[PDB]
Paper text:
[name] is an adaptor protein expressed in most immune cell lineages. It presents two structural domains in its sequence, an N-terminal Fer/CIP4 homology-Bin/Amphiphysin/Rvs (F-[name]) domain and a C-terminal SH3 domain, connected by a linker region. The F-[name] domain of [name] binds to the PEST subfamily of protein tyrosine phosphatases (PTPs): PTPN12, also known as PTP-PEST, PTPN18, and the lymphoid phosphatase ([name]), encoded by the gene PTPN22. Positively charged residues on the concave surface of F-[name] domains interact with the polar heads of the phospholipids in the cellular membrane.
Author numbering:
A (entry chain B), B (entry chain A): 5 to 289
Amino acid sequence: LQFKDAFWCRDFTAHTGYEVLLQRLLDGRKMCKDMEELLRQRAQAEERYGKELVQIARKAGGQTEINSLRASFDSLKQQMENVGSSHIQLALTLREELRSLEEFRERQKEQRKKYEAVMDRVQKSKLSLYKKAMESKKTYEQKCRDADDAEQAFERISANGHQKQVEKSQNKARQCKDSATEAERVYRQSIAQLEKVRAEWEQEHRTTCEAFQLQEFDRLTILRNALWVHSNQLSMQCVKDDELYEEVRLTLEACSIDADIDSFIQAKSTGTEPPAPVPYQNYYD
Amino acid sequence: LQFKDAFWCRDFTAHTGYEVLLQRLLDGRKMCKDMEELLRQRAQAEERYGKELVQIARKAGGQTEINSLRASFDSLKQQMENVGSSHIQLALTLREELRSLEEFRERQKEQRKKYEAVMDRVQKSKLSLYKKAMESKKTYEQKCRDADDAEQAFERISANGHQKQVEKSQNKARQCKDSATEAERVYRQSIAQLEKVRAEWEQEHRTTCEAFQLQEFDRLTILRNALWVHSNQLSMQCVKDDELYEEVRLTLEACSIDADIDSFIQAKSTGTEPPAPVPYQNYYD
């Protein structure tokens, strides 16, 4: 199905098809803004979260610990900062995707406005010339009835009437037929002018429908792609973080409880022999 | 080598080995607090981050969109709330791990204080009896020098001195030797009392060292496992989030651009034929 084949109106004076299509583009524009707002707020959350993780890592303690357990705790603080910075970078990625959608939306608005100007102009002219044609049609039909009455009035009083009275109706019927001829010419001219604009309107409408369908195809394409890219970027963030936390686990594999205890003893041992007992010392021996 | 075999002092009055071991337990207690503070702050970040994701999802728009693209956007909002709620649950998980370490830390302090009480009592008694023994040694040696002087005074005048003077110095020298003998028995007893406490101190020291080593083994074990659990819980969060974002991609695979355009046309189509042209209508037909 195409837009150009499904949004016509049997009513000559109705442009509901164009109104419905234009309303769809406005609804699509709102959808693009909502997708933009979600990216903006998500980016703000990621930056706030990422900065907080970095602050926790930089301010965390562990300075009284030594050896392999210290190296494992230091690894966690280091990888926390790496995750936090990676989320700050993710916020920049989301804001670039947001900027791309923002550019696409205004580009579509610019082109949409041009078609709106053409359609508004030709639709107003079409309804104006239709109004004039129906006014000319009414006048033409009244002038015909006026001419028929004048002719019937002439034939009536021309059977036993005075030449002066007949001459009055003779001229009145002639003037009425002249007015009917002129009203027909104006009516025919009104029909010709309306037909010229109707042909232009039909082509512009069909042209606009093809353009509006291309905009909708492009918008649905870029919005579906944006959701796919967004979901992948979030999934890629989970993979990056998992790899960074794995670095902590790898350090933990090198953490041996016995080695740390042996390391403390070797570094801080004060002596291996208890003090000798205090004996009695004879002052003369 | 063990704590009980490596933290002795050859100096009888020094307990640096016990002081060094006690300092290590205090440093280890600070390390447990630092691990507690990191978990506490990480939980706060996860709760704040999780709550923000839920609010973004609940307030996000998309109400003007229809059909499969709407279902994809609604899927993203739904999975955002599921991720946000999952992070709030993660914060509760972290606070339970934090509570477990807090309980372990205070249990160790309670037991540590008990060993400190035993060591403080026997070390002070050991230093007290040593001080008294050295005082008895000083008194005993002074009484001996007094006896030597009294004996030297007797030997001086016993060659050409008056019998009365010689007898007088003989009695003074004998009385001084008696005082030195009495002071010797006091000195010998001081040594015996100190030796009983020295043996008691040595056994208590060895007992405390074995206990302090068991505490260090327990602390290093629970802190190593806490880091392992923490890293695993964060990695499990990456997998949970990745599974939730995968649900969005599954919805996107069912998103067809042609189907959405066809669905809009079928629902909003206004007509398939353009309006007929307005002809000139002869009043006499």
